[PDB]
Amino acid sequence: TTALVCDNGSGLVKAGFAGDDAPRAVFPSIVGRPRHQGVMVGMGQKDSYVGDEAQSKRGILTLKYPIEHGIITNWDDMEKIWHHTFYNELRVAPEEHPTLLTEAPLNPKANREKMTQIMFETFNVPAMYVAIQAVLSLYASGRTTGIVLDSGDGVTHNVPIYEGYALPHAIMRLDLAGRDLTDYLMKILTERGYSFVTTAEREIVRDIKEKLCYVALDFENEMATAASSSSLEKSYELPDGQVITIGNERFRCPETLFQPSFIGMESAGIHETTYNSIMKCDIDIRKDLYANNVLSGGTTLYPGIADRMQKEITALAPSTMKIKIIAPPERKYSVWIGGSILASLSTFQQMWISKQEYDEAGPSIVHRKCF
Amino acid sequence: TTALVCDNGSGLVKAGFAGDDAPRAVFPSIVGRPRHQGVMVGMGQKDSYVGDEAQSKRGILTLKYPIEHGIITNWDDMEKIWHHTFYNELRVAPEEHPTLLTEAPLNPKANREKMTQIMFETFNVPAMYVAIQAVLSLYASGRTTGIVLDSGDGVTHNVPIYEGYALPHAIMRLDLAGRDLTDYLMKILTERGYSFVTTAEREIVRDIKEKLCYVALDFENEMATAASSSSLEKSYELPDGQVITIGNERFRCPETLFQPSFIGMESAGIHETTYNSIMKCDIDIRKDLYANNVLSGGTTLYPGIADRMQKEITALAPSTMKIKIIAPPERKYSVWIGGSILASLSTFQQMWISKQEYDEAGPSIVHRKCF
Amino acid sequence: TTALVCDNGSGLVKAGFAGDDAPRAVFPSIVGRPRHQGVMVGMGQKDSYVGDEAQSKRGILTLKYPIEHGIITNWDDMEKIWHHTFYNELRVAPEEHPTLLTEAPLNPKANREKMTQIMFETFNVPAMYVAIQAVLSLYASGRTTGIVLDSGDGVTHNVPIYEGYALPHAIMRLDLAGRDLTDYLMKILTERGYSFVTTAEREIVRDIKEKLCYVALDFENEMATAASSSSLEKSYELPDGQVITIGNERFRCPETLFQPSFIGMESAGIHETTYNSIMKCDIDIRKDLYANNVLSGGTTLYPGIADRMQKEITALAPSTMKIKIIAPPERKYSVWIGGSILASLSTFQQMWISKQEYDEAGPSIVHRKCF
Amino acid sequence: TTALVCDNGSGLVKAGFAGDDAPRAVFPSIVGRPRHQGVMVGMGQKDSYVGDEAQSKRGILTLKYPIEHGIITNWDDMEKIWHHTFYNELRVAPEEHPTLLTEAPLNPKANREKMTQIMFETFNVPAMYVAIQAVLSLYASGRTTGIVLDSGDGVTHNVPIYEGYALPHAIMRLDLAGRDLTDYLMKILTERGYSFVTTAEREIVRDIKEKLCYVALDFENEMATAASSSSLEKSYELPDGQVITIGNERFRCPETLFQPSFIGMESAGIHETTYNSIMKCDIDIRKDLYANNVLSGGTTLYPGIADRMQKEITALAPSTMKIKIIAPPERKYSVWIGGSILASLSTFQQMWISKQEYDEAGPSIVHRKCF
């Protein structure tokens, strides 16, 4: 049987087999095109690079992302990425391999339908399925009750689950994600004298964010300590040299999550969004939801995000009850792990969308089957 | 022999064996159905919960009561409750166990007939019986003369008995019960800012009534003290927190029993209903009926109901004689205790309705046997 | 001269002029009071409705009857009814109009005295009279000998008259009347599932009795036919719909007259009460009393009451003589007709109670004049 | 005298003089605050805009509503709105002008008391009054009997009135209103690709609802026609362009009124809520209530709401009687019209709450005067 699991995401692709411990193929979802003249002969060089190949040669080509905010915008580029992760990296023939895909909540309906057409016609898979990302995150932890805040690169969303029952009317979606955090870092870096405008230079700024930035417990008095002393500065070495220094911008970029007014959005922070979802549910189920808060998604991997979230939540909730933010140690590959577990149960082998059903019903079978 | 005793009631089920001191199984009579979508797999969750299981998971399912005002309205749900109290809780086989059932006065005749069909065919009991609830309340106290006011959750009724002879023409029945008291509390709680509309939130309001409400000796001057001082307020903590305060609504809900015009009914209070029953009997037996007033039924467990009833009764009766309201200390499990006593006498072993009689005569044997 | 005739009765008022054929004003004796809040303005609505007006608006107000069992209990309400039948309906000035009133046998003496005070002082009638109801029933039929059984809504009474001479020691009075028949119908209607408890819903039950109920010749074998076949059922449509079905309760309510043990009274039926009165008279006058039995009063208008009475009477009397129950075709307005005849004879114009006699003697002149 | 009439409502303010035909001032109840930096000088721009001014400049400021679900939550903002409708729009001095206010049923008591304090102290009105909104709706139609369903933007409520008498125990209140309908439209619009998250973009979605949405007679077969053909689609032009298309969402948003499970509420629809109120009244008054159903309130202005309500009501009521939903042509300004009529009668000039009474008694005089 050997079912396949694929996590498209936005900016990172995780692929592997069902029943394993970790994905066997991780690579960025980027397609590049040459930019310059192209002199000399006998080189035999390709016209487009996809995956980790584009990262190595990013100095002469332009990076482009097909998926954005969860929705796929370039369908011609996505067929190139799926071909790369099936024949070149996994080295498998999809003709005898059911696949599992993931999808964010509150997405256009046409997004699901087009994914089914490509897999069932271009690749000719025998079966396929589509599942919500945040539901699979609860399978990895071996739990049944709790509220999951899954923040990635495209979109962060919230959904409460109580004893295997979802509440579709208490689901909140917010655009703020890790991609908008990188752009804010680029803007506030110009006040020190550094300019980063090329699309190939957006990777330089992203790597700085992943290594230096951190979340401060308190914002008012942290800016006071950084204003006087210089003990909060670290150095980064660019690829060609010219080391740089980072001061109070180190803890200012992640703060946008709790104060989304730094870019201009009117929505509330992630600490108030998750409180409104809890108060939208029933009265007697809120007690179990407070003590089962789950964190998932790489943008929730900042040093100190678990203690800051706890401090703000207890300021709103009544003081009688106990609030504990359950942040596991491996939060980035939590969705994939849940997908592998789900695709191995004996009771799940009846909900596959077969080829016969698609031929008789058409692409509209997804909404009647998947969710 | 080991006869069985069951008290269906309305909202609470008492079951046990004959010859014991207390019922061994007490649980609400509630059947619940899931309401929400139901995501995830491998849970193996049931489609309906009955009894104490529904109370634990009441936050996602809907509560429904089959019995109402004494009459059973959902016969499909009642067979589910009887199955729960025979195999799951009592853990007994009804094939070799006679059972005893209770019934309120002035009920539709078809109610008795359908109960006999289910027990004698679905469960195949060897014998069965049906008795009036208020008659059994006199067995518990070891008395022979007196007037019994049995107020429960569905219906309150009155019946006088003098030296082992009943007076069927002096029996009064009034709908006002504990279920209508909870609904009135919900309506008058909105004037302070609290909203309780979900059927799962009716249990929250009921628990407040069972812990805080009390009966005031006088109504006119009690409202004057509560209007000026704030020494009559208590606090209640909701399951999620947000403690609340109760003022003069504390003693206003139980007052509806004595003044049924608060909801809109035209009938008189319980103090005047029991006086009319006494005056409907013979002249020379009224003296023994005045001094043998008996209270039974949980809704007669309010703090102060015994002194208030005495004050109103002596205002109508002549001042020569003595009026004493005999309110025992355990009034909730008084009917069950009387049923256990009755099902153990050697002289009662001849009035069982046998299987042979039912086959020859049919379901109409009850009216010719029971009452 | 134009004397006036008024028949107070109990539950129905008959008024008119002397010398006519039928009463010109018939309306119930009911006074109603508003029950609900009473929102809005500019309506100009009264605080009390009396007569046929209360029947139209009975859905928001409470019905109350002043006269009961023959005796008047609410003297303030009776002055309201008398004012309605003199100025509003008859449209006459009582200052120049002698009036005639009726009274049941064996009544408190204070009942007669208070009626004389009100008429002679509040209304200032020039003359008045009080007569026994059952004596006037013999004037309508143009007879001189016979025994009259007058059953109405308040009380049924018996009195034998032989050739213009009454026998005061052979007069029997029984409370059982049409008002107790309606209450019994309400109680036995609950065994089918219908509840009628509001005082405004007592009119619904009364109308069912006047249209469907009938008297059965034999009771033992009639219950056998109704137990097997369903050919004895009729349908009634309530004002809002929800039609109902009546089975063996159709002929059970009127049976209470012959078997007064259904409510709990110890007295004998109307067939045995009228036999005891005959045997209480002299031996040689019984022959003419047997063949001159007269029926009067609306509660004697049930279909089949004349044949049932004959069957029971001949079972007690000797078989030699002939028994014939003379039931006329218009038995409801028989008392009024007799009153009109009496108030027109030239020999009756000397027994009026004048204003001069009342002033000199006082209210005690009635007992010395009327009976 | 020239009494003043004000209808606060929730989201729309109607003001005018007593004795006219239409309100002279209609404007939204919205207070806005600047959001952005605010460069340049010499502009002289205000710090807060209230009324129609905020709608024009809504692109840079944030809209906020003080009144919500009937209860006022921001008392500082309400004093700003009342000042705007007295000096800026009506251009009147409230020192010599009695005012009339409206209030929804089943509201916190403190809501009425605080309104009296502000008017009698800050504005110094000589007299004032508070009336129920649904009672005034019957004055406009010139009727005395009927059941009124008043659905607005904050809360829909029901109350039956029979011949100028209200039934307080048959009053039902349901939160579902027009504000929850707009939020549902925003959520289901994301499935086509349109995002509307800014509070200033909630006005864009509301305008779409007021122009395109309609109620379908049947829901099951209407979704079948929209699934196959494309004849049920209309186009809307956004302020900057980018026209959009609406398909089956056109008739899905108003359907929430009849099926409140689309959001997650457990209560029944408006067709079943109004049927339960009728069955809660007396038996003989239901006939006049069925034929006098009155519609009022802008959310009852959807194309086809009158025919759909009739179809569902006759499915529950008995088939004998006639049901007619009396939906007038101008249902939005029905409450104001009734208030103008009431404040002009000569008999109403005695129920004003004077300044002298307030000084002697205090703010608690309202409950003893108004309702």
Ligand SMILES: Nc1ncnc2c1ncn2[C@@H]1O[C@H](COP(=O)(O)OP(=O)(O)O)[C@@H](O)[C@H]1O
């Ligand atoms: N150690 C880290 N600290 C902070 N942010 C991180 C870290 N690792 C990854 N990220 C952020 O997480 C994002 C990747 O999220 P990912 O789990 O791939 O979501 P998706 O699968 O939906 O693309 C990147 O944009 C990156 O900015």
Ligand SMILES: Nc1ncnc2c1ncn2[C@@H]1O[C@H](COP(=O)(O)OP(=O)(O)O)[C@@H](O)[C@H]1O
């Ligand atoms: N301590 C108490 N004080 C006041 N009311 C009570 C108390 N305990 C129970 N009740 C009321 O009594 C009702 C239960 O009555 P119950 O004895 O179960 O009658 P039945 O057996 O006919 O259901 C409940 O509705 C509850 O409101």
Ligand SMILES: Nc1ncnc2c1ncn2[C@@H]1O[C@H](COP(=O)(O)OP(=O)(O)O)[C@@H](O)[C@H]1O
């Ligand atoms: N057609 C009928 N069949 C049976 N009973 C009737 C009929 N008409 C009237 N009655 C009964 O007769 C009573 C009216 O009696 P009525 O002649 O008014 O006596 P009174 O004048 O003393 O009130 C009512 O209570 C009603 O129940």
Ligand SMILES: Nc1ncnc2c1ncn2[C@@H]1O[C@H](COP(=O)(O)OP(=O)(O)O)[C@@H](O)[C@H]1O
């Ligand atoms: N033509 C229309 N069709 C449908 N809904 C409407 C229409 N006009 C107004 N509404 C709705 O009615 C609401 C306004 O109700 P309103 O009469 O102002 O009540 P209130 O005075 O209590 O605010 C708005 O929220 C709007 O959604």
Ligand SMILES: [Mg+2]
């Ligand atoms: Mg992710």
Ligand SMILES: [Mg+2]
């Ligand atoms: Mg009980």
Ligand SMILES: [Mg+2]
């Ligand atoms: Mg009569």
Ligand SMILES: [Mg+2]
């Ligand atoms: Mg309105």
